[PDB]
Structure formats: C-alpha cells, structure tokens
Write a protein that binds this ligand. Structure first.
Ligand code: UTP
Ligand code: UTP
Lengths: 285, 285
C-alpha cells in the first residue's frame, strides 16, 4: 500500500555544533552506528521500500553509508573479518532503494518535502524527521500502526505524544476533541505552535512523523519560510486529518542533550554492548 | 624545544564499525565535538604549534573541521548567533598550523611517521595516535610532562601505562628494570609486540604517545610493512630511550566500549551539559 518515505536531511545542524560542523548531524555516532541508520531501519521495518533523502551538497557521507565501499570491503576480506564484512554489505534489505534529490537553499522542511514532488508522483507517502529517533518495544513500531490506519481510513496521519502540562510551550500542539489512546487516532482541526501554558488545546506534541497523500505537494506550492503545518492547514479544507498517538518513546538527536539521552537508552538496549555498558555506568561513583 | 606533532589518521577503523564506515573514526562525536579535537586541544596545551596530519583520501572531514566553514560562518552572522559561531572559529589558536600529508598505502604506523619526514625537517617531534584519548586533572597534561623530560634528558619518551598481567598479549609492552612512578620515566631496553600472556617483560602497555629525535626518520628508511618499535630498537643501540608512566586517565576510541567509556567520563564534566547529563543518568535505575 504505502512504500515511499521522504527523509529531509539538508539541515545545517547549527544547534548541534561543533559536532555537526564537518560531518552531518544525521551521522552522529549513536552507541556504534550513525543516527540516520535507526530512522531508515524504522521505515524499512514498517513496509517502506523507497527511501528519499532530500539532502544538501555537504551530506554525501549519508548517501555513501547506504552504498558499497570498495576499499573497506576489500581490506576487511584481506583481514578475513567477514562477519564485519556482511555488516556493511547489507545495511538496507536487497529489495530497498535509497534515492537522492537536493534542497538547493535551506528554506525550511515544507520547501524540503516539496523537493520530492517528482520522485513521489501520484503516490501517498510518509515523512520522517531523522533528527528524531523513536523506540518501539511492543514488537510492531508506531509507523507500522500509523500507516495501516492511513490504509484503512484514507486520512493523513500526524504522530504526536503526551508531554507534561507545564511544558506545552516548547511544542507544536495538536487541537482535538478528546486525547486518543496510545496507538490510536482521532480527527484534528489544526496544530498550535508554543501554546500558552494554560489555554492549550491538548497535552499532545507534533513528534515529526506524517503519512500524507500527493494532494499535499500542490498545496505546498500555494502556502503564502514555507510551512508544512500551513499545508496540512489547507489539506483539512478537502480531507479528514487525524492524530496518531505513539506507544513508544522519542529522542531529539537535533539537540546535544536529547542526543546524550539517546546514547544512554539504545546503549543499554544494545544486544552486545548493553551488558558491558550498564557496567560502565554502575562503575561511575 | 619540541614544537611539531605527527597525528597519523590514515586508518580505516575496521574495529570501530559501522560507526566509521562513512565518517572517520576520528570525526566520531564523543559528547558534542569529534574525538580528534581532544587530541589536538591536548597537543596545543603542551606547546605544539604545528599539527602534521598523516591522512587518507577518506578523511577531508578532518582537515575541514580545522578550517573556515563559509556557509556556517556567514549564515551565523545573519542570525547574529554569536555563541554558536564561537564554537567553530576558536578551535585552535591563530599561531597553530594544521598540515596534511597523504599516506598512500596503510603499510604501518612506522610507515605513516615516515611520510612526514619531509615536513618534520631536522627537528625533534611528538607523535599522537587519535584512536587514543588522554585525560588530565593535574593541570599539566601527560604530553607536556613528556616534553619537559625529552628537553631536560634529551632521551626519547614512550608513554606507557599498566594493564592486568592477562591482557599483555593485546599490547606492545616495554622492557623496564623497574616500574617508573606515575609521572616519571626510566630507561627501557626495548618493547615487544603482543608478548604471549606469560613472557611479558612488564605490565606497562605502550599507550600511543611518543616524543622522538628527528633521526628516527633515518632509521625508518631502513627497517624489517614498517614497524615503529623496530626503529625505536635501532635508536635503542646508539641512544637512551625511556618509558614515561602517565598520571592521567586513558580511553581507546578505536574500541566501542572505549568510546562509550569516554562519552560518559568526558560528558559528566562538560561545562554546560555536565550537570544536566549526570541528571539523565541518575534517572535510569
Ligand atoms: O531548510 C531546511 C530545514 C530543515 N531541513 C531538515 O529538517 C530537519 C529538521 O532540522 P532542525 O529543525 O532540527 O534543524 P537543522 O538541522 O536545519 O539545524 P538547526 O536548527 O538544528 O541548527 C533536518 O533533518 C533538516 O535536514 C531541511 O532539509 N531543510
Ligand atoms: O599503517 C598504519 C597504522 C596505523 N595508522 C594510524 O593509526 C590510527 C588507528 O590505528 P588502528 O590500527 O586502530 O587503525 P584502523 O583504523 O585500521 O583500525 P583497526 O581495525 O586496524 O584496529 C589511525 O589514525 C591511522 O591513520 C596509519 O595511518 N597507518
């Protein structure tokens, strides 16, 4: 049914400096692999086949990480380290493509999703902000559940999560009737940015996953900084727009500090490293 | 007056994979800055004025990180974001030069140091392996100690530190008459590579920190593909060579568990993130 994700990655990482001065912020080493691995893996594990990096002139280290490296592949072999060889050989599944198009000047996410117009054609497509990680535990991920909900309903979906009632000013917060349950959706007439700490419509924050149709690109070319939330504003005129509520847990790798938080959570959960890792903490006082 | 330092960064970090598949294992972000910054910030602290990168074609990221980034610099005086701009200009004093030389083929540590002969000229010099981070809390880092000691003694200095008797076959370890006290040096008759767990002349791992006479250049052009501990022998005939035991802590950012250990110990002491980070940690158990 749904098989194109668009991943915007043209962002200068200003807040993630100097780490992101010379490499991209998408390649930040979370435990033992770059951040963009987990965001793609999420998409792959959901039923996506075609990844679409909207990318910048400087983020070639990204496209390259989904591709065969001759020089390494051949040194690994001469070492006889073939386990490790078969890591780098099969990062994505053999039946997944990774595509590039260029956001020429960085004029915000909305202008970035619009750069995929041509690759997305008439297909209904998800988005994933890769500066945000998501950690399902259930077994089936939040993008999995969200999509099947966009297959059933035909309503553009918007992933959101509950925050403390005293921190709703940091977040774009969705409007709704009542708050739908962990891993369900309910209609929504619009998102408010940094609402007043009282007088906020909901305690549910735009996370930065979306499943939209192609209508949306025609709208992006007519939004009076081009706003995605402006385009979903116009979609509402014609089409039902719901809020899919997470069951798992997000991480803001866009920020130095939500990055450190992510290293702790995934590191402890690392199939090999976790054991030896949990030890390295304990050992600290 | 030791004022030059060969940083060999031509490796392919197979041991630190796939982190370092598409970015150097030196550009790997410890807390908020890549790993190599800590090594240079160490070399500069100890009097170095010329940083000689023996590098590979996979590794512009590095040379660039020590350069003007034109889009970031000019974009951040648009936003008059003076604090973030601060974060990517001061990286090393105006007087510190960073010079690239290319290691065509990875035919050994030995063979890297010798690609820099051309540039080191007739002049005694230091060698710093980035794989390895060193941490002071003494107010004179281990390298400046070693350069105080080459200057007064005139005798080459091998930084070593002690390891459990049962991992000695994972290291070069040195032939010493006795163990030099944390912070001092003693003559040594030679080093061994990976001496079987029994036949180790000492517990002291060669760490990855050398001060050397510039005529080692001339003994690397004639060794039994080229090994340093080889050339440090041939000196060991003509001249005195001393093992300096280190007083500060040590982290291998070529091993995974070693990089994770550093994210923790460095991060807990970060000016800003430190107090906020420690917090994240107390919040897990
Ligand atoms: O013009 C833009 C803005 C943002 N984006 C993409 O949208 C996502 C959101 O990116 P962020 O909003 O976290 O910011 P940024 O990376 O542009 O830089 P800072 O504000 O942290 O300094 C990132 O993955 C980025 O690549 C673009 O592709 N183009
Ligand atoms: O022949 C050599 C050996 C070492 N080095 C320099 O030593 C440093 C790392 O030494 P390593 O031995 O860790 O390099 P590697 O990246 O090949 O990793 P392994 O999988 O072999 O463990 C790097 O900074 C590299 O440039 C060379 O440049 N050439």
């Amino acid at each position: 049914m749904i098989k194109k994700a668009v991943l915007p990655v043209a962002g200068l990482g200003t807040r993630f400096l100097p780490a992101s001065k010379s490499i991209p912020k998408e390649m930040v080493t979370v435990v033992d692999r770059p951040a963009i691995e987990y965001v793609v893996r999420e998409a792959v594990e959901a039923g996506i086949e075609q990844i679409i990096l909207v990318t910048h002139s400087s983020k070639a280290s990204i496209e390259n990480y989904f591709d065969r490296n001759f020089e390494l592949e051949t040194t690994l072999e001469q070492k006889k380290k073939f386990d490790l060889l078969a890591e780098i050989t099969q990062i994505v599944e053999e039946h997944v493509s990774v595509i590039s198009v260029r956001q020429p000047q960085p004029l915000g996410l909305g202008h970035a999703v619009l750069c995929a117009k041509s690759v997305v054609g008439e297909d209904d497509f998800a988005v994933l902000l890769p500066d945000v990680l998501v950690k399902d535990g259930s077994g089936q991920n939040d993008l999995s559940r969200m999509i099947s909900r966009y297959n059933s309903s035909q309503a553009a979906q918007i992933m959101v999560e509950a925050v403390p009632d005293h921190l709703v000013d940091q977040y774009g917060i969705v409007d709704v009737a009542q708050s739908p349950n962990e891993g369900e959706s309910i209609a929504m007439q619009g998102i408010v940015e940094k609402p007043p700490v009282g007088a906020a419509p909901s305690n549910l924050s735009v996370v930065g996953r979306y499943v939209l149709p192609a209508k949306i690109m025609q709208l992006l070319e007519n939004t009076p900084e081009i706003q995605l939330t402006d385009a979903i504003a116009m979609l509402q005129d014609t089409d039902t727009v719901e809020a899919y509520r997470m069951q798992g847990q997000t991480f803001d790798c866009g920020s130095k500090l939500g990055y450190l938080k992510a290293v702790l959570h995934y590191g402890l959960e690392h199939p090999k490293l976790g054991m030896e890792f949990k030890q390295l903490i304990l050992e600290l006082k």
